[PDB]
Every structure is written in C-alpha cells, then in structure tokens.
Amino acid sequence: AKAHVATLEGNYSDIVLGRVVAFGDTGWNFKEVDMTFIADDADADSKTTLFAGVLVGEDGTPATAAAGVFGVLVDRKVLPGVDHYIGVFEPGEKVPMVLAVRGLTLNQLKLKYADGTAIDAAGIQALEAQGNQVTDKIVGTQFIGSVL
Amino acid sequence: AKAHVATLEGNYSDIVLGRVVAFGDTGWNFKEVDMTFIADDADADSKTTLFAGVLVGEDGTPATAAAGVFGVLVDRKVLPGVDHYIGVFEPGEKVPMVLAVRGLTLNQLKLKYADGTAIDAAGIQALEAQGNQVTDKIVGTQFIGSVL
Numbered sequence: 093a094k095a096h097v098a099t100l101e102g103n104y105s106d107i108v109l110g111r112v113v114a115f116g117d118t119g120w121n122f123k124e125v126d127m128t129f130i131a132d133d134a135d136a137d138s139k140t141t142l143f144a145g146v147l148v149g150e151d152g153t154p155a156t157a158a159a160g161v162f163g164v165l166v167d168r169k170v171l172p173g174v175d176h177y178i179g180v181f182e183p184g185e186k187v188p189m190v191l192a193v194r195g196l197t198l199n200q201l202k203l204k205y206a207d208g209t210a211i212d213a214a215g216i217q218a219l220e221a222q223g224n225q226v227t228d229k230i231v232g233t234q235f236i237g238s239v240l
Numbered sequence: 241a242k243a244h245v246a247t248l249e250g251n252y253s254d255i256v257l258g259r260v261v262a263f264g265d266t267g268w269n270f271k272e273v274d275m276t277f278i279a280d281d282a283d284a285d286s287k288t289t290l291f292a293g294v295l296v297g298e299d300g301t302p303a304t305a306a307a308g309v310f311g312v313l314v315d316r317k318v319l320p321g322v323d324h325y326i327g328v329f330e331p332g333e334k335v336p337m338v339l340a341v342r343g344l345t346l347n348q349l350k351l352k353y354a355d356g357t358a359i360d361a362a363g364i365q366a367l368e369a370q371g372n373q374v375t376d377k378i379v380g381t382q383f384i385g386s387v388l
Contacts, residue, residue: 094327094329094330095328096326096327179242179244180242180244
C-alpha cells in the first residue's frame, strides 16, 4: 500500500538570496499584478498550478518564452508547503500576486519557465536588465551517504 | 468569498441500527469482498466514489439493479468522516472490504445504489431474503429553526 508521505525541501531565502534595502520605501523592489490562480477549467478542489520561482510577465501570464520575462513570482501564497488554499478560489478567478523586479540577488537554478524548463541565456539577459544579479555561486549541501 | 470548510453529519450505527449477535462467533453477520478502491483509471490522489451504504453484489462490485444486490458496505475505511487514504493505493488496485448481510436492522434513508439512487422496492425485497429488517420508522432530528 505504499505510504502517505509528504516532503518539504525548500525555503523563501533560497530564491531571493538578498535585496537592496531602500530607505524611502521597502516596497521599491516589488510589483503587484493580477494572476489566474486556479486554471479556468480545473475543478474547484484542484490545487493551483503556480509554483514559487516561476517567471511571469507584467500582465500576470507565466512566460513560455524568454522575451516575456518581467519578474519572479515570490508570493507568500505559493511558497513551498502552503497547500491550504484548495477550493478557496473560484476557478477562473484573478487574484493579486507579488512579483520581485528590482534590486535582488536571484538564484539561477530556481528560476523556471511556465513549464518547469530552466531559463536560457536570453532569459538571463532579459531579467538582468531590471537590475538583478543572477548568480551560479551556490555551495549546496550533501546528505547522509556522501563522505566528508 | 467562499471559505475553506468541512462537514461531518453522519456516522456508523445509522446505516446499521442493530444486530443479532451470535454467542459462538461475533463475526457471523459480516463477510469480506474484494473491490477496487481507487477508480480503475483515475488519478492516484483522486478520492474514491465509494461511500458507506452502497449496495454490492456477491462478486465484490457495486450494484446497479435489484438483482445485483447481496449486502451493504460498512467498511471502516469508508465511514463518513475519514479521509486520509490519499494515494496510498493504485488505480485498479484490489483491496479487501467488509459487508453486512445477515441479521441486521437497516436504514432505508441511507441505502444507495452505485450512482446514489435511493433503494427501490425490488432491491429492498431482494436484500430481505438474507434476513435483514428494512425500516422507515426513524425519528428525524429537527435542527434550530422551527419551534418546538
């Protein structure tokens, strides 16, 4: 019968590795857009297909091409482990979401197109123009079986 | 504007109202059958359509008419209120279940065909051959509202 198991292996700090803190307004780095949280046709109890770290344009549509990259979805409603919002939204509803745009250090690996596929060089160049530092310098971690 | 909600407004000891307990063996009334828990072609996390009170034949399949009735299903795993069999099975995977056939006092308002149709006259008559009482003498509860 297998087993009922759940796993959580990620945090918010692993996507936005750091900011530039403004003195005039702490919201200088974020923009708010309206997004289709639950697909139009999916049943009310279907979980949302959005996952933290996806690249979304300024019009709320996840990017399937490098050109339509405007920001990284970092809303607190789609972070790893937050599964409560099931059936809480009418299918086809559009709900505001928070995008991070300017003045950030962004992890290369967690950025992903609408369909999970990693981002190319064109995407990196397009996103950097907003003033973000996409980096590959992550130490990582090793577990259990890896001798040290 | 519709919030996450759940309900539990039914339980065991209503589909079956009382037994005749054999002194020699407490398990004379019941019987095991083998049925597919998760639909033969649905998703692993998708919930089963089985609910307590659904009539099944002697081969372990839900009934469709009066002739395909052998007993009721009162298994522990399907009692109204319990739902944590999330992907612990596979599509079409057989699982043992428990029926209720002999020496029982049953409730008409709860018995249902496979699709939920209220039990008909022929189904009642057939299920009485096993020696079970079928009654409508039920004092329904009047909830807050009208005056008592």
